Design a protein around this ligand. Structure first.
Ligand SMILES: *C[C@@H](COC(=O)CCCCCCCCCCCCCCC)OC(=O)CCCCCCCCCCCCCCC
Ligand SMILES: *C(=O)CCCCCCCCCCCCCCC
Lengths: 225, 392, 10, 409, 225
């Protein structure tokens, strides 16, 4: 009963012609349906932690055991379709495609994996009804407000039944009154199909809403500090 | 570190990417002008070889220009060989011309009379097939027919023909009768050309035309490509300039019109390559908009910042025209020297080449001109814009 | 054009 | 029915910037400068081959069988042997006369031949280019003559004028007595393409026997063949039935050099336009590598959404083809309005410079034709797209190796 | 007696159907050696004000007289000599030339002024010696860290004895411990050579080290509005 097993994933980064160990001896266990939170300073390495568990960076020391399959043994094309229906990525820098509309942006994982054309406009427009942006589906995100376009990327990866969503500051560029609207929606997916997600922010206010409370400061922790 | 303040900030803008493909993208403007010159000098070199061999078989066997008088014939005692010192003339020889018509026992033919002096050197003397030049004696009226002329007339050696002059005819009051005498042949010369079918060698002293004098003087030129350029110089009085443009004025003029059509079609390679400079430097300014405002804040006039982007559009034209002319002259000279590399053509005529040194200099200055005028518009957009109102 | 030879065959 | 490899990248090309609106204009002009001139370039090459079969090949005989300086007293039985050859359509005798014309104090080279006017319309298209109203007045016994268009400019005579030509005497002994001049009246002139205007004349066969003071004897035998690409084998076997050996010739040694010069342009102009489109496809490379580094944030989004290597590589392949297809199809629209209307175009330039080109003295014709073929339009379309696909394949491989974790995703 | 006498700088750039003013009735006074500071909200006109004292734009209402010389009467070529050794510009968006190294980047104002080569190899490296980047002179700024390459542009304009060092957020994207160490180096140029500078920022806590702490709220400054 384990989703992701992380042990001794020391990531080295070239900082001034020297592979410095920004992370070392990290141990993080992900459970099925567990509510966890990751807090830390801006520079400890909590932003690049999602790239090691996702598959964007190379595990030069150790291996991430996701569902009993190590990603180090997989090839480059073998890690492509794994990150489509099993993992998700939510950022805070508003990484949305400005060429497409709001309806075709959330249907982008449904088009890569060669799904059915009848399933395209059947699992993408219903996600905008849960957030409350179905009336602005045929609009451009460049002419919207600050907090309206940020809610599009929250339900972007939640279209093909994910298992582990790697969030990174979801309450970044929207108001506090709309910040709890995406948090009450995330509590329903554990009662619908039983998925888990970890939230990586900096402040201590929204991190206490999860069940498991643990910090992450330079990869050094024993119980709590 | 350079003492010039303008060329120092451009030596690192061409090799900023140390990649196997990133360096090839920035050097795409050099290959477009290099391949455009070497596809222009090499193709025009074999077109000049066609014009070189055409003059050695047609213009090298006929008199180019004759200095005749405007009142008919020319007295040699009034105009000697010492007062004919003109530009481009290296040898003066007496000669006569005129339209004549043949009359044999089988058929007639066409030709022009070509009276030469046997006491002087003539270029047709190696082409004489067992015929001596001393047989052309005055009073004997000996005619040396050509190879293709005597082949269709059926006149062998030791025969008798009749030459009539319809142009220089005596205007008798009783009617119109042309002057004609009896002429015998002595041999047949061959030169493997087209002028042998209408040119024969007769004596210079003849009474078939008017008046014992000559009509003009034969002159040789070093370059017969510029006869119209020296046609407006100072000529002595009592003379009329008569060149080869009256008969062959449409044959050698047809070769010059073909060079203006092939050379302009091959000039479209550097015309599109000049359009590549506008797109390679037009996109370079918009991705380096932050570096323009830095030089304006550190202190730089907008007149000198226009010259900065002018070097990037002129460095590909300078080194592209020299390398294109070096590879263009090497391909034309080594075309059929070692092995045929362009293909085995089914001609078998030993295709020559002619590389003119003056033609390389005028071609390379064209590629350095259209590459510079197309650079002024991307250079003006980087200077006419505001330094602070654009992005920061 | 301009490339002529005028070679016959009997 | 859009597929996954092309995607929906039509909206990616609608970018907004500074002077980028002018870069898209020159990118479709320089790539269409070598395509629109190649369609009209090969249109005039097909027009030169079309006019050769109607004004050059249809006016001269293919095979010529002459006599080696001997009068043919048994030429009647030789016409039956050449007619039954499997590959010879018709046959007609002809007499060559090497005479000149002397009328008006001038000198012109004319080549008059004696052909039968009743049998001249069965082997060549000779009386179909006469400026007169008819040609059926060429009977026997009234001394007819018909000249070309290039003879009347020097003699300054029209239809109904008596001219005097030079006719040689067929004396049995090699001697000269007097020149023969017979007064002949012309009954109209004929026009041809660019060569046989000042050196072409015809007399009837019955009016040619009285000039040589003979009976029924000809000199050469003309013929007409179906296939014209092989004119060296049909003449050799056709002359082995009359006598031992005669002088054989064809139209290859005197008029067959025009096919070598026409096909040489197609092996040069098509080879020169490879380098024209080859430097025009560098405009696609300069706008594809530039479109990677500024839009590198959107490439890292699709890698996090679970895209394979073949999907992120095929985006920039079809993106570079959109700038090439708009420029290649822009040369087809110009290529059909210049080729189909070339005769008001070439005549418009010649009346403003002062001097006209393509004179009818030593060239093929005086005008410039254009026969547009639809097979050459498909050949130039795939050639411009094959060079654009080779130019956009190498920046597509560089964009597939972008690290998504290096940029701030 | 005075360095720059600003008097009624009303400027209207592009915005609206009719052009509206972002600065109006600005009466500023710069003295030789005095310390000033400008604070305000990001977008009020605190960043667009600095383009008018240096001479990059046309003010079209009023006159800017710097050291007794109005910039409206001088041409564009005459302002290039003025913006070389009398004023300096420091930004926060990291506008450095990536083609050059760190040593040749600070010697760029020393080359346009047509100086001798003896001043190129002496006055350039002494500025990275003071800021502490002498060992990283022959290096590329593209491979540096976040706070290392930001200190290159601070000592870039201080190579030819400036008089009015115009600074636009010097504490942009570097460490806070490194943020005041260059301010102590800025605080020593008054007693060796003697120069004036103003620090434009959006916080009052980092502007308390100056003498005349002023503000800029929509172009209306009287004392502390
Ligand atoms: C008689 C004809 C052809 O004459 C020749 O003999 C041509 C010369 C043969 C060239 C052989 C070259 C062999 C070596 C090649 C090496 C290539 C190297 C390349 C780099 C590696 O005379 C002619 O030339 C015919 C000219 C016909 C021109 C027709 C096109 C004109 C089109 C109009 C001009 C363009 C208008 C554009 C308007 C925008
Ligand atoms: C020798 O074979 C005689 C050839 C006579 C025709 C020569 C034509 C030269 C010019 C050809 C132009 C082709 C392109 C026309 C459209 C631009």
């Amino acid at each position: 009963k384990i989703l992701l097993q992380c042990d001794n994933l020391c990531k080295r980064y070239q900082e001034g012609s020297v592979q410095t160990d920004v992370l070392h001896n990290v141990s993080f266990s992900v459970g099925e349906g567990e509510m966890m939170a990751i807090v830390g300073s801006s520079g400890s390495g909590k932003s690049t932690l999602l790239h090691l568990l996702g598959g964007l960076d190379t595990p030069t020391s150790g291996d991430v055991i996701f569902n009993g399959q190590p990603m180090s043994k997989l090839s480059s094309a073998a890690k492509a379709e794994l990150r489509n229906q099993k993992l998700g990525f939510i950022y805070q820098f508003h990484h949305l495609l400005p060429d497409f509309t709001a309806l075709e942006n959330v249907a982008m994982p449904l088009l890569i994996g060669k799904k059915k054309p009848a399933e395209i406009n059947s699992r993408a427009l219903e996600m905008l009804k849960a957030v409350g942006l179905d009336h602005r589906a045929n609009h451009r995100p460049s002419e919207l407000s600050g907090g309206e376009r940020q809610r599009v990327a929250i339900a972007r990866a939640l279209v093909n039944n994910p298992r582990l969503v790697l969030a990174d500051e979801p309450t970044g560029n929207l108001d506090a009154r709309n910040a709890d609207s995406i948090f009450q929606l995330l509590g329903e997916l554990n009662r619908l199909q039983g998925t888990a997600f970890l939230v990586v922010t900096h402040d201590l206010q929204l991190a206490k809403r999860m069940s498991r409370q643990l910090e992450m400061r330079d990869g050094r922790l024993t119980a709590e500090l | 570190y350079q003492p010039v303040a303008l060329f120092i900030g451009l030596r690192y803008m061409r090799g900023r990417a140390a990649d196997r493909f990133g360096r090839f993208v920035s050097w795409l403007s050099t290959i477009g002008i290099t391949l455009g010159v070497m596809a222009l000098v090499t193709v025009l070199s074999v077109m000049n070889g066609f014009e070189r061999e055409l003059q050695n078989n047609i213009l090298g066997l006929m008199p180019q220009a004759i200095l005749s008088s405007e009142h008919g014939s020319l007295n040699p005692q009034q105009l000697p060989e010492t007062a004919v010192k003109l530009d481009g003339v290296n040898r003066v020889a007496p000669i006569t011309t005129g339209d004549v018509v043949l009359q044999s026992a089988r058929s007639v033919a066409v030709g022009v009379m070509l009276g030469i002096d046997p006491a002087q050197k003539d270029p047709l003397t190696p082409y004489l097939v067992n015929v001596k030049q001393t047989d052309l004696e005055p009073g004997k009226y000996n005619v040396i027919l050509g190879e293709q002329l005597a082949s269709q007339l059926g006149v062998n050696r030791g025969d008798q023909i009749r030459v009539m002059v319809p142009s220089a005819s005596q205007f008798t009051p009783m009617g119109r009768i042309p002057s004609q005498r009896l002429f015998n042949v002595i041999g047949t010369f061959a030169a493997n050309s087209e002028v042998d079918g209408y040119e024969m060698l007769v004596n210079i002293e003849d009474a078939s035309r008017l008046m014992g004098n000559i009509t003009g003087w034969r002159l040789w030129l070093d370059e017969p490509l510029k006869v119209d350029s020296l046609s407006q110089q100072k000529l002595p009085e009592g003379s009329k300039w008569q060149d080869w443009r009256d008969r062959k004025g449409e044959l050698f003029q047809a070769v010059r019109m073909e060079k203006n059509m092939m050379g302009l079609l091959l000039s479209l390679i550097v015309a599109v390559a000049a359009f590549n400079i506008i797109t390679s430097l037009g996109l370079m300014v918009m991705e380096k908009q932050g570096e323009v405002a830095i030089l304006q804040t550190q202190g730089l006039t907008p007149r000198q910042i226009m010259m900065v982007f002018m070097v990037q559009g002129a460095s590909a034209g300078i080194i592209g025209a020299i390398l294109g002319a070096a590879l263009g002259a090497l391909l034309a000279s080594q075309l059929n020297n070692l092995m045929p590399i362009i293909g085995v053509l089914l001609d078998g005529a030993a295709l020559p080449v002619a590389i003119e040194p003056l033609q390389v200099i005028v071609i390379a200055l064209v590629a350095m001109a259209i590459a510079l005028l197309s650079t002024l518009y991307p250079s003006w957009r980087a200077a006419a814009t505001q330094p602070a109102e654009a992005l920061r | 054009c301009s490339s002529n030879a005028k070679i016959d065959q009997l | 029915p859009l597929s996954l490899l092309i995607g929906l990248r039509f909206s990616r090309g609608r970018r907004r910037g500074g002077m980028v609106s002018l870069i898209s204009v020159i990118s479709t002009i320089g790539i269409a400068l070598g395509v629109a001139v190649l369609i009209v370039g090969l249109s005039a090459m097909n027009g030169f081959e079309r006019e050769l079969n109607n004004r050059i090949l249809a006016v001269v005989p293919h095979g010529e069988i002459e006599a080696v300086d001997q009068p043919w007293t048994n030429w009647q039985e030789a016409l039956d042997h050449v007619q039954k050859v499997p590959g010879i359509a018709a046959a007609a005798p002809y007499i060559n006369f090497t005479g000149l014309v002397e009328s008006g104090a001038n000198l012109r080279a004319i080549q008059v031949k004696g052909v039968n006017p009743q049998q001249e319309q069965r082997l060549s298209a000779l009386p179909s280019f006469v400026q007169g109203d008819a040609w059926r007045n060429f009977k026997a016994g009234e001394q007819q003559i018909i000249i070309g268009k290039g003879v009347a400019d020097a003699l300054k005579v029209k239809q109904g004028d008596w001219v005097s030509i030079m006719i040689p005497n067929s004396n049995p002994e090699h001697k000269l007595m007097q020149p023969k001049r017979v007064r002949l009246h012309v009954a109209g002139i004929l026009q041809l393409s660019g060569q046989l205007d000042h050196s072409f004349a015809m007399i009837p066969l019955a009016d040619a026997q009285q000039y040589l003071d003979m009976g029924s004897s000809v000199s050469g035998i003309a013929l007409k063949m179906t296939d014209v690409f092989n004119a060296n084998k049909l003449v050799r076997d056709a002359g082995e039935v009359t006598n031992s050996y005669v002088y054989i010739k064809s139209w290859i040694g005197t008029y067959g050099y025009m096919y070598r010069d026409i096909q040489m342009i197609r092996a040069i102009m098509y080879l020169a336009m490879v380098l024209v489109i080859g430097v025009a496809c560098f405009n696609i490379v300069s706008t594809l590598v530039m479109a990677v580094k500024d839009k590198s944030g959107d490439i890292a989004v699709l890698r996090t959404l679970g895209a394979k290597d073949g999907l992120i590589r095929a985006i920039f392949v079809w993106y570079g083809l959109l700038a090439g297809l708009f420029g290649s199809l822009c040369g087809v629209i110009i290529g059909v309005v210049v080729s189909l209307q070339l005769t008001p175009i070439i005549e418009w330039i010649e009346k403003l410079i002062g001097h006209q080109f393509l004179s009818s003295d030593i060239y093929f014709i005086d005008f410039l034709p254009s026969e547009l073929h639809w097979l050459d339009v498909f050949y130039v379309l795939v050639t411009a797209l094959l060079l654009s696909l080779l130019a956009s394949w190498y920046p597509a491989r560089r964009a597939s190796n972008i690290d998504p974790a290096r940029v701030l995703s």
